[PDB]
A = this chain, B = another copy of it.
Amino acid sequence: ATSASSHLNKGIKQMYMNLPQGEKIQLMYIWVDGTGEGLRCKTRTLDCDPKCVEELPEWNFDGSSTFQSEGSNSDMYLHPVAMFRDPFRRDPNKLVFCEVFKYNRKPAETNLRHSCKRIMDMVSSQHPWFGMEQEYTLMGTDGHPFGWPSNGFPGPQGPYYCGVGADKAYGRDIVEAHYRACLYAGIKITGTNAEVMPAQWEFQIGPCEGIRMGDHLWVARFILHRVCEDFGVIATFDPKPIPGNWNGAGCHTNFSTKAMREENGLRCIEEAIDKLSKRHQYHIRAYDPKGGLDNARRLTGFTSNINDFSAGVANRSASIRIPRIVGQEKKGYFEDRRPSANCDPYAVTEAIVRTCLLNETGDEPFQY
């Protein structure tokens, strides 16, 4: 069951997009709404052919329509912070991820990018590298996963992981289109695979230094949403898209700095793991938009326990996993398997840096 807009003749759209647009450039403005998990987009025309993000002009939108402000002063300004080519409108047009701001220049409630960027500007001396493996479930318009039998379930799990075939991988066309669009847009995407759950996939955004990780992950999520809209399906980042004995959707996070990637860098990995063991409660609170409510359906064991912390080397069921190659070479990175699929990358990255590099302690972040 696909969307009604998907059944429109795409040949007409291809013919219309084949027109030479000319000097005019369409700038698609992207930002995060008040829910903290959704995205919003609207386009504008610019004729100067800009080169840098700082050249792009500020924009404003009605925040009362995005669950971001009341009716008194509902106007919210958009400050561009990321600059990417548009894969749905080819090279001349561009994708613009923006930072939401209130009417009085204050950061919005869901605008975690301001604090995240401040933290990484503080810690840039250590060069923190992040990589997050977003896992999403391809769902039809009917609320059930794509390709799943009507009013039923497919076979048991096990053949679907990284599977090839009509009965092993559902909606691979969406994944291929999203991969090509992310490569075209300049998103630092490293790879993709099919997860254990059928119609559930994964794409790994590559090492991005600091705020670039959150920027690239958010733009990749928007690109995936637009590709699924073109194909007529819905990509949901719910941690537990289907209750029962089905694999949950999570977003593991890899963390590494200059010392952790240097020779004999395992000691810093142990220090970071101990700090995360100390701040497990804060991290699990900050690893999803609902403060652990959504992640309680994925990290239920039977995925590490939500209420119990555990770490180890090459442990799939541990909250923090050290790659076996990292332990063998005594250097590399460590993977945080706690964050959910709908987690805000800015909050996750900020919490990881605060616990590791800033030695933060307590139950609340410290304002600097």
B179 with A26: CB separation less than 8 A: yes
Contact with B along A229-261 (1 / 0, CB 8 A): 111111100000000110000000000000000
A191 with B42: CB separation less than 8 A: yes
Q: Is A114 in contact with chain B by the CB < 8 A criterion?
A: no
Number of interface residues of A (CB under 8 A): 112
The listed residue (B10, B20, B64) touching A184 by CB distance below 8 A is B20
Q: Which residues of B have CB within 8 Å of A163?
A: 38, 40-41
Q: Is A4 in contact with chain B by the CB < 8 A criterion?
A: yes
Contact with B along A266-296 (1 / 0, CB 8 A): 0000000000000000000000000000000
A12 with B230: CB separation less than 8 A: yes
A172 with B231: CB separation less than 8 A: no
Chain B nearest Cβ from A260, distance in angstroms = 19
A5 with B171: CB separation less than 8 A: yes
In the bound complex, how far is the Cα of B74 from the Cα of A316, in angstroms?
A: 8
B5 with A161: CB separation less than 8 A: no
B234 with A176: CB separation less than 8 A: no
* Contact flag A149-B150 (CB < 8 Å), given A165-B234, A183-B22: yes
In the bound complex, how far is the Cα of B141 from the Cα of A148, in angstroms?
A: 12
In chain A, residues 202-233, which have Cβ atoms closer than 8 Å to a Cβ of chain B?
206, 222, 225-233
In chain A, residues 323-364, which have Cβ atoms closer than 8 Å to a Cβ of chain B?
323-325
